[PDB]
């Protein structure tokens, strides 16, 4: 019933640039959003849970924020290992994904 | 009027301050089976929490007092509110929140102000 608008669908940046991805919700969801990272031929990995809580073991360059309807996932200083597809999660509905290059 | 236990919880700090014995009565009595150990643990907990409040009143020279006047002057950093905007505006619930941080500091000031007061009284009677 909920609709998650993830933008942009794809982007490209250099090593060391600041990358931000947004997920907009069609109605208020509190802080119930999770961010994942999925590389080619691999299972997703949980980056951020509950909108703004960084998961253990994830490098500190990642960060998330948001509440009510506007959310964001940020990679401070992009690296080579960060090339993957990132998507937000609201319960059983996922964002359409962002392919970083 | 007789509002009852915590009856003046929503009343002003001045109104509730006249109903102190109400809350003072029910602080110690109330308003190897499973329940047996569950009740014994509660009977000991009630005494410990009671004697802790009594312990603080004792080392503040307030033992036996409900309203106790001290010597520590009110630091306006704690709350820069006027007297009439406290006792006739606020509820003790709100007041405990606004003085949450500074409460531990006042508790120390009230202690040495009593050990120096009786040390002085020991000299006043040394003649």
């Amino acid at each position: 019933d909920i609709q998650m608008t993830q933008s942009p669908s794809s982007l490209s940046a250099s090593l060391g640039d600041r990358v931000t991805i947004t997920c907009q919700a069609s109605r208020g969801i509190g802080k119930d959003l999770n961010w994942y990272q999925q590389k080619a031929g691999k299972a997703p990995k949980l980056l951020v849970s509950d909108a703004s809580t960084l998961e253990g073991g994830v490098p500190s360059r990642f960060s998330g924020s948001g509440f009510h309807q506007n959310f964001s996932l940020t990679i401070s200083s992009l690296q080579a290992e960060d090339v993957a597809t990132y998507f937000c999660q609201q319960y059983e509905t996922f964002g359409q994904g962002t392919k970083v290059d | 009027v007789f509002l009852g236990f915590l009856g003046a919880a929503g009343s002003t700090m001045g109104a509730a301050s006249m109903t102190l014995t109400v809350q003072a009565r029910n602080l110690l009595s109330g308003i190897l089976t499973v329940w047996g150990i569950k009740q014994l643990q509660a009977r000991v907990l009630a005494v410990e929490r009671y004697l802790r409040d009594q312990q603080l009143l004792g080392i503040w020279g307030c033992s036996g007092k409900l309203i106790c006047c001290t010597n520590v002057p009110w630091n306006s950093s704690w709350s820069n509110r006027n007297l009439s905007e406290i006792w006739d505006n606020m509820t003790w619930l709100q007041w405990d929140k606004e003085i949450s941080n500074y409460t531990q500091i006042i508790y120390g000031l009230l202690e040495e102000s009593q050990n120096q007061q009786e040390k002085n009284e020991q000299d006043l009677l040394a003649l």
């Binding site: - | 001045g14 109104a15 009439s84 905007e85 006739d88 505006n89 509820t91 619930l93």
Partner: protein
Amino acid sequence: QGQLVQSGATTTKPGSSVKISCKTSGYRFNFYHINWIRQTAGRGPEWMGWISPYSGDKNLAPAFQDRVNMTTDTEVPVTSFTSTGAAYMEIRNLTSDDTGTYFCAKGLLRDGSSTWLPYLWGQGTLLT
């Protein structure tokens, strides 16, 4: 320590009645009276009356007792010490003498000798 927003400038003509709103926030609505005061062209300021949202009690000057409809809703609690209220005001026999800016004012204290004193005001509404 909150806002008391009011309605817009609804300009009618004599004979009719006008209902002005006063929506509160940032403070417990039922803990303070709501005073109504007006400053018209022809006189200075004139105190109309206050109403107690808690007790429902109403006290207004004899110059406006047979004209003013003063009612209040019931607060929708936001937090332990915050709510949102609403105070209404109407006038019966409206004329051009009653043209001016009207405000609502929250009472000053919860006890003492200045309980209902208009302390926290709204923004004003322009009548006919």
